[PDB]
Amino acid sequence: GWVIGVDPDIGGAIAVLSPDGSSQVFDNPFVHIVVSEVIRKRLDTKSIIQLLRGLDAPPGTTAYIEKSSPFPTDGKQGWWSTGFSYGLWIASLVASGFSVVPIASQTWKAYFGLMRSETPKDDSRQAASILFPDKDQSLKLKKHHGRAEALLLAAYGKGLVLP
Amino acid sequence: GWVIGVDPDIGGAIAVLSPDGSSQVFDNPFVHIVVSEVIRKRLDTKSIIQLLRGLDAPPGTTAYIEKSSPFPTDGKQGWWSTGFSYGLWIASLVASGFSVVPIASQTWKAYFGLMRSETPKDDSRQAASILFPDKDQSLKLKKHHGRAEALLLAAYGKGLVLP
DNA sequence: CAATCGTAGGAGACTGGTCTCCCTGCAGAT
DNA sequence: ATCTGCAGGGTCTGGTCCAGACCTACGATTG
Ligand SMILES: [Ca+2]
Ligand SMILES: [Ca+2]
Ligand SMILES: [Ca+2]
Ligand SMILES: [Ca+2]
Numbered sequence: 192g193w194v195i196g197v198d199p200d201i202g203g204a205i206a207v208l209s210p211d212g213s214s215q216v217f218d219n220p221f222v223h224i225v226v227s228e229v230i231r232k233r234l235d236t237k238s239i240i241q242l243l244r245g246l247d248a249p250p251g252t253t254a255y256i257e258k259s260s261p262f263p264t265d266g267k268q269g270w271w272s273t274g275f276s277y278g279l280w281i282a283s284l285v286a287s288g289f290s291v292v293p294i295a296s297q298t299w300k301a302y303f304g305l306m307r308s309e310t311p312k313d314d315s316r317q318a319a320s321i322l323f324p325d326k327d328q329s330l331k332l333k334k335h336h337g338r339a340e341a342l343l344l345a346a347y348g349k350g351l352v353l354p
Numbered sequence: 355g356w357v358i359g360v361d362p363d364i365g366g367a368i369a370v371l372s373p374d375g376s377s378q379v380f381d382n383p384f385v386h387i388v389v390s391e392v393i394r395k396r397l398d399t400k401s402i403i404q405l406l407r408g409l410d411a412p413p414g415t416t417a418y419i420e421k422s423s424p425f426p427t428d429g430k431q432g433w434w435s436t437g438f439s440y441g442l443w444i445a446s447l448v449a450s451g452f453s454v455v456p457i458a459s460q461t462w463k464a465y466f467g468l469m470r471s472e473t474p475k476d477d478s479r480q481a482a483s484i485l486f487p488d489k490d491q492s493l494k495l496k497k498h499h500g501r502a503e504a505l506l507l508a509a510y511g512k513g514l515v516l517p
Numbered sequence: 518c519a520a521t522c523g524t525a526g527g528a529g530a531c532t533g534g535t536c537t538c539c540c541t542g543c544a545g546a547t
Numbered sequence: 548a549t550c551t552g553c554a555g556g557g558t559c560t561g562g563t564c565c566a567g568a569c570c571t572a573c574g575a576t577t578g
Contacts, residue, residue, distance in 0.1 A: 200571065227528050231573080234441075236448045259434070260558045261571050266525030267426070267433040269572040270557095274434035275422075276571095278397075278441030285399045286449035295559050296569050306568060334519065363540060390558045394542080424540055426527045429555030432541040433527095439540095458529050459538050469537065497549065519578085526573075542556075547549090 195246075195254035195289060196345030199280040200273070201232050202334065203257075204341035207248055208349050214323050216338045217242060233272075234279050243287035250288030255348040256280060257340065258293040292348070299347040312336035315343060321353060322346050356411035358452060359508025360419040361500045362443040363436060364395050369504035370409055371512050377486050379501045380405060397442050406450040413451030418511040419443060420503065421456040455511070462510040475499040478506060484516060485509050 192210030197203070199219070206216040220238030223230045259273035284291050300306045308314045316330045319339035323346075330339055359369040362382070369379045383401035386393045422440040424433050447454045463469045471477045479493045482502035486509075493502055 202571095229574090236445050236454075240445065240449050257570095258559085259571075260569065261430075261434070262525095262569080263430065263557045264525070265430070265557095265571060266573080267424075267428070267430050268526060269570090270430040270434040270525095271422070271424070271437035271527095271572090273571055274437030275441035278438040278443075279445045280441075282399050282403065282442045282445035283449060286403050286446060291399075297560060297567095300569075301560080311569095332519070333521095365540090391564095392543090420539090421529080422540085423528045423538065425538080425555095427555070428527095428540060429542080430525095431556055432539090433555095434541090434557095436540055460530060460536090463538075464530080474538090495549075521577080522575075524573085524575105525571100540555100542554090543552100545550100545552080547551105 192349070193248050193252040194345045194348040195248060195252055195284075196341045196343070196348060197254060197256040197280055197284070198337050198340040198344065199234075199256060199259070199276045200337065201234065201276065203276075203337040205242065206338070206341035206345040207246055208345045209247075214326060214342065214345070216326060216329065216341055218338065234276055236279055236283070239279070239283050240287065243283055243289075246287075248289070252289050253292055253348055254284045254289040255292050255294050255344045256284070257299075257344060258295055260295065294344060294347065299343055302347055303343060303353060312339075315339040318353060319343055319346075322351055356415040357508045357511040358409075358411060358415055358417035358447075359504045359506070359511060360417060360443055360447070361503040361507065362419055362422070362439045363500070364397065364439065365497065366420075366439075366500040367504035368405065369501070369508040370411060371508045372410075377489060377505065377508075379489060379492065379505055381501065397439055399442060399446070402442065402446045403449070406446055406452075409450075411452070415452050416511055417447045417452040417454050418457050418462075418507045419447065419454060420462075420507060421458050423458065457507060457510065462507055465510050466506060466516060475502075478502040481516060482506055482509075485514060 194208045196206040203219045220235035221232045222235045259277045316339040319342040357371045366382045383398035385398045422436040479502040482505040
């Protein structure tokens, strides 16, 4: 009963669901780096692999990861960064012994009846709250939608149902 | 000691120099995948990790990797792929215990005096052949530039000089 | 630190200037 | 297969193509 869920973006997170119902969710580690004489955020490769090595999740545990489908109206930098975060997470998860399953956001949103929402990120946090009430405190802020995403991805993988 | 050189893109390659002088170079493993109704080539995560784990270079071996820097005039698909390749390789290298050092193409080309060449890819292959004569049979085709790049990036990190 | 808003953008090496560098993706011809 | 050439491009899930859905990065200003 082990499932991992990853929202790989910069504001994303990794969630881990244990057989006994317990869950953990961690903000994606990032660093500030110099690019074209400005500072940009980038996922912290060594920290992520350090995180994944310290999980009690056994090797072979399925990880569900949201696939990057950036909009054509998004800038080239957005396309590069979402590509880069996707690749860094995929390899980190495979190298750590996990079976990787990409999932489009329409898939898990459709499973939880969240498509076409007027406030998708607040609704994401509400759903994760109801599926994981012990993470309620860790979902209070609007900036926590990444923790919720990761949690809903894992819930999707586990087969959980909203009441 | 040991030096790794990686050209990270789809036509790219990984080179490995031993302290004893013997060199190895392998084409980047890739797979065909469906994207938006067409086939696209994509680096093969599990093969890369499988490859890295089979190397004899010890942990802490420095891995020089070519820094992604797509042209602003390149398409957004190009921006995403180079980002993805770059992220998949970095994480793979870190997970295998290597110390990753990103190098701009201008740095290794200037070292070997290859800047502002009208046939850069031919030139790379000729220099790699001079630097690694037993790799001559592996550099004879024009599509082999990636092998040569990887070899020249590694030759840069080892401090080898052209005659 | 937490939120909202608008747009979609190069980056890199040797007191700023100047010059450099790819890649993807798709079609064709042999 | 190898190469040359040229432009810079969404992608996804699901019910013979296509509808209708989905972000993200990167800076600003507000407190
Ligand atoms: Ca998302
Ligand atoms: Ca997110
Ligand atoms: Ca290159
Ligand atoms: Ca290359």
